[PDB]
């Protein structure tokens, strides 16, 4: 579902700068 990707897409952003 979109939310499943949105969560990953959003966590991928905040956790990518780490």
mmCIF file of C-alpha atoms in Angstrom:
data_model
loop_
_atom_site.group_PDB
_atom_site.id
_atom_site.type_symbol
_atom_site.label_atom_id
_atom_site.label_comp_id
_atom_site.label_asym_id
_atom_site.label_seq_id
_atom_site.Cartn_x
_atom_site.Cartn_y
_atom_site.Cartn_z
ATOM 1 C CA UNK A 1 0.000 0.000 0.000
ATOM 2 C CA UNK A 2 1.172 3.631 -0.442
ATOM 3 C CA UNK A 3 1.629 4.118 3.339
ATOM 4 C CA UNK A 4 3.905 1.035 3.291
ATOM 5 C CA UNK A 5 6.110 2.821 0.741
ATOM 6 C CA UNK A 6 5.559 6.301 2.235
ATOM 7 C CA UNK A 7 6.855 5.067 5.621
ATOM 8 C CA UNK A 8 9.897 3.482 3.931
ATOM 9 C CA UNK A 9 10.303 6.521 1.645
ATOM 10 C CA UNK A 10 10.081 8.830 4.677
ATOM 11 C CA UNK A 11 12.297 6.670 6.961
ATOM 12 C CA UNK A 12 14.673 6.337 3.995
ATOM 13 C CA UNK A 13 15.030 10.145 4.144
ATOM 14 C CA UNK A 14 15.458 10.814 7.900
ATOM 15 C CA UNK A 15 17.610 7.674 8.310
ATOM 16 C CA UNK A 16 19.572 8.308 5.066
ATOM 17 C CA UNK A 17 21.306 11.428 6.478
ATOM 18 C CA UNK A 18 22.700 9.162 9.246
#
